[PDB]
Amino acid sequence: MAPRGFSCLLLLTGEIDLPVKRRA
């Protein structure tokens, strides 16, 4: 269960909390 709110929320909730993606 993740509506449009879960996206716009996660997009901001999860940004600089993942050092695994160091290719971008």
Backbone as CSV, one residue per row, in Angstrom:
resi,resn,N_x,N_y,N_z,CA_x,CA_y,CA_z,C_x,C_y,C_z
1,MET,0.839,-1.226,0.000,0.000,0.000,0.000,0.862,1.259,0.000
2,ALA,1.016,1.864,-1.173,1.816,3.075,-1.309,1.278,3.965,-2.427
3,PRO,0.320,4.852,-2.105,-0.276,5.762,-3.088,0.698,6.848,-3.533
4,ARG,0.175,7.867,-4.208,1.004,8.969,-4.687,1.700,9.673,-3.530
5,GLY,1.149,9.507,-2.337,1.722,10.122,-1.159,2.973,9.407,-0.692
6,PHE,3.023,8.099,-0.927,4.172,7.294,-0.530,5.371,7.572,-1.430
7,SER,5.095,8.028,-2.645,6.148,8.339,-3.603,6.768,9.699,-3.298
8,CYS,5.947,10.743,-3.347,6.413,12.095,-3.066,7.011,12.178,-1.665
9,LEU,6.561,11.286,-0.785,7.049,11.249,0.586,8.395,10.536,0.656
10,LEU,8.473,9.372,0.018,9.703,8.591,0.003,10.795,9.325,-0.767
11,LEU,10.403,9.997,-1.845,11.348,10.747,-2.663,12.088,11.776,-1.813
12,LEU,11.412,12.273,-0.782,12.001,13.257,0.117,12.510,12.588,1.391
13,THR,11.883,11.475,1.761,12.273,10.739,2.958,13.568,9.968,2.723
14,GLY,13.781,9.541,1.483,14.983,8.798,1.150,15.756,9.428,0.008
15,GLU,16.791,10.191,0.348,17.613,10.853,-0.657,19.097,10.650,-0.366
16,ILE,19.567,11.246,0.724,20.966,11.131,1.115,21.148,10.075,2.200
17,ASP,20.300,9.051,2.168,20.367,7.973,3.149,20.688,6.644,2.475
18,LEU,21.480,6.701,1.410,21.864,5.502,0.674,23.220,5.689,-0.003
19,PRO,24.315,5.340,0.695,25.670,5.473,0.156,26.025,4.367,-0.835
20,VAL,25.083,3.459,-1.074,25.305,2.356,-2.001,25.262,2.837,-3.448
21,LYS,24.471,3.876,-3.697,24.341,4.433,-5.039,25.327,5.578,-5.252
22,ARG,26.586,5.229,-5.494,27.627,6.227,-5.715,28.064,6.242,-7.177
23,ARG,27.119,5.975,-8.073,27.406,5.958,-9.502,26.767,7.152,-10.201
24,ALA,25.636,7.608,-9.672,24.926,8.745,-10.244,25.795,9.997,-10.228
